[PDB]
Amino acid sequence: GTKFPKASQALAQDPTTRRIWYGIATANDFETNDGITEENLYQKIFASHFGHLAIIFLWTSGNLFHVAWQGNFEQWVKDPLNTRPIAHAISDPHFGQRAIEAFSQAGASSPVNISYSGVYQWWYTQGMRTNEELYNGAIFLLILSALSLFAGWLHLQPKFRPNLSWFKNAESRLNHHLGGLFGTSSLAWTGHIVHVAIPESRGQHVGWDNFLQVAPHPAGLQPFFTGNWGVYTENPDTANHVFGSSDGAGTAILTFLGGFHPQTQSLWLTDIAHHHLAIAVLFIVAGHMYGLYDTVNNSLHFQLGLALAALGVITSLVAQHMYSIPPYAYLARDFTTQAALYTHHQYIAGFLMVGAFAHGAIFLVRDYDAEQNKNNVLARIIDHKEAIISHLSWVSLFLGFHTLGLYVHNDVVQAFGTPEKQILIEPVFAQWIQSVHGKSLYGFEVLLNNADSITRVAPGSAQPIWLPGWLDAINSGNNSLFLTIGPGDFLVHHAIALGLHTTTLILVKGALDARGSKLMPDKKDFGYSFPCDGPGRGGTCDISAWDAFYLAVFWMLNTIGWTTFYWHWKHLGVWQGNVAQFNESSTYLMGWFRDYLWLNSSQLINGYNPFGMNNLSVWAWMFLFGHLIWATGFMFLISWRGYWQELIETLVWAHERTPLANLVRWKDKPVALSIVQARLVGLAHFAVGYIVTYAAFLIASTASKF
Amino acid sequence: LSTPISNSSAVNGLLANLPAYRKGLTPRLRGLEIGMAHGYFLTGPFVELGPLRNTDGGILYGSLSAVGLVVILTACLALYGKANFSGSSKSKDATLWESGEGWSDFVSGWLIGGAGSVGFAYLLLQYI
C-alpha cells in the first residue's frame, strides 16, 4: 500500500521487490494506467513524442558540440584521405601512462577516439568547412530541443489541449505531412544544396554574412518563370575537378551526370539536388487528395505496427543503397566507416520489422474485435489462418535441410582433400539481373548489354542520359556497385532467405496465435504478456504471444548477423583487392571459421598482452566484455524462477539470524525475477552481448589493416 | 537455531557488550563507537593497496580515499534513515534499530567517529 508506482495501482500494493521492477516495466505502458481515458491518452502521446524529438536533436547537438570543441574537422577538410576523424576526448581517471600514450592518436596530444560515424564526410558534403559552422548547429538544436519541450508542455495545458477528433483525423495528417514534412523539406534540401553545398564544393564560401547576395547561378530566376529550365544544364564539373576547390569547377546546379565523381567515388551534388526536387513534387500533389479505415484509426498499435513496418522496410533500404551507392565524398574509402553504418542500420531494421509484428499481436489481443471486423480483408486471413502458417512452416524446413546440406557436403569433400567434389551453384538468376542492369561481366548479352535495345537508346524522347556515367561504373570493379558473385553468394542468399522465412513465420504465427489455439483457446483473456498456463495439459511454457516475439529476437539477430557477416567478409577482400580468398572459401563453413572469424581476430585479440598494449585495448576489452554479458544472458534463459526463489529464502533466513546485521531490514521482500522478466532480462543480455561482441570485432579488425 | 555458538556465554558477552546491543549508550555515542571502529581500519587497505602506493603521498591519498567511503556511508546510514524510517513508524520493540528514535544524530555520530578515526589514524603511519 505504497504510493509508488503511480501508473499501476495494483503493483503499488505489492510488498515485495517485484513492485519496483514491474513498476518500471509498466510505467510508459499508458494503456494500463489507472483511471485512464482515451482523450488523456492521446494528449499524453503527443507530448511524449516531443521529449523523444528533443533527445534526437540533443544527440545530434551532442554529435555537433563535441566535434567542434574536441574534433579535427577543420584539420580534416584539408586532406581527408589520411586524417582520422576524432569523436571526442578521453577523460578517464583510471588510465595509466601507457594507456594515455596509446590513445593519444589521430595526431592529437591528449587521448581521443577515432570517430567512425561518418558525420565528417556527411557534413563536408553539406557545405560545412570550419569548426565554427559546426558550433552553430549544436547551439541551434539546443533551442529546438527546449522549444519542443516547451511545446510538449504547451499542448498539455487546458487552453491548448487538443480534442480527440483532431488526433484521429488520419487523412489530414498524411496530407499535411506529404505536403509539409515530406514535400517542403525535400524541395528545400535541394535549395540548400544549390545555395550552399555546391558553391563550397567549388571553392566559393557562402555563409549567413553573404547568402542573400550571391546567387546560385549567374542569371537564375529569369529562365525560371519563362519555363526555360534548360539553362540549369550549363557546364558541369570536368573529370579533372578536385572536390572542394575551384580547379575544374563548373557552374551547374541541376544535372543528370550519373555514376560517381572520379576522385571522391560518390554522387554528384547537383545529382542529389535534382532527385530531391523531383520527389518533393510527387508528395505535394498526392497530399491534396483527401470499413478498414474505421479499424486502423481506433487502434494505436495497428498504426504504430504499420509505422514500424514502414520504418523497418526503409531502414533496410538505407543500408542496401548506401553501400552500393555512396553519397558522401570519400565515404566509400573509409572502410571501417562503411562497415559500421551498414551493420548498425541493418540491426535497427531487424528490430523494427520484429517490433512491427510485436505491436500487431498486441492489437489482436486488446483491440481486434471479431464482430466489428467481419467479412473484411483482416478476418479473411484469420479464415485460412492454419493454411498460411503450415505452408510457411514447410518452406523453412525445406530451405534449411538443403542449404545446410550443401555447405556440409562441400566441407566433408574439402576435408578429404577433394575440393573438386564440392557442390557450387552459380547464381545465374542474379547474374542475369546485373547483366540486365548493364553489367557486361557475366555476358548474358541482353538488355543494356545489348547495345541496340530500345531501353538503352530510348527512342521516345531522348531521355536516357544517366547511361554513360552508369555504364562506366558498372563495368569497373573499383566500387561496390553490383559486386561480383559466385557460389558463396548463392548459398548465403538462400541462407538469408531461410533466415527471413523462419523469422517471419514465428512473428506472423505469434500474432495469429495471440488470441487463441487449441492448446489455449482463451489466451486473449490473460493479456499479451503472461507467464504460461501451468504444467497441466502436457505443459505450457512459452505459450504467450510475448514469448513468440522473444524467440524471434534470437532468430533475427542470427539473420541480421548472417547478412552483416556476409557483407563484412566480402568487403574485406575488395578493400584489400584480393577477392579470390573469399570466392573459394565462402562456399563451405570451415572457410567462414578459418578465413573470417579466426583470421580477422588476430589484431583485435592482441589489443593488450604481456608485452604491451595498443589503441585497440578498448575494443579488445569490449570484445571480452560482450562475451561475458552474452553468456550472462544464458543464465536467466536456462535457469528458471523456482530454483532462485528457494535459494533466496536461505539468504533471507541467514540475514535475519546473523547478529550485527539482523538489526537492519529490507523494505521490499526479496524475490526472484519473474518468468517473463527472466526471458526479457536474459534476452537483453544476450542481445547486447550479441552486438557488443560484433561491434568490437568489426571496428577493430578493419581499423588495423584498412 | 539453538546450539552452540548462538547460545554460548563467550558470544553473549561479546554480542551484548558491543555498542549496537549495549543498553547504556546514546545514539550519538553508540553511533560513535560503531563509527570509531569501522572507520579506523578503513585507512588500512588504501594506504597499502590503492591506485598509487609507492608515493609520498601514499598515506595522504590513502587516507583521503578512506574518508571518501565514509561520506558515502553517512549517506547510506541516512538513506536507511530516509527509507526505513519514513514518518517515524514504530514497531513491536523500538530500539535504536527497530524504530528510529535517535537516528538524526546517529548518522552524524558515524560522521564524527568515522572521519575522526582517519583523522586519528593518519598520524600513526604517516607521522610519529
Binding site: 505504497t2 509508488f4 519496483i20 513498476g23 576526448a89 577523460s91 523494505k667 521490499d668 | 549517506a75 527509507a83
Partner: peptide, 30 residues
Amino acid sequence: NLPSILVPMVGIVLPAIVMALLFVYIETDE
C-alpha cells in the same frame, strides 16, 4: 581544466544524488 572536474561530477556525484532522490521516491508512501 574542464573535463577533469566535470566527469567525476556527472559519473560520481550526479548518481549519488539522482539515485538518492530515486531512493526516496521508490520507498515512500502517501
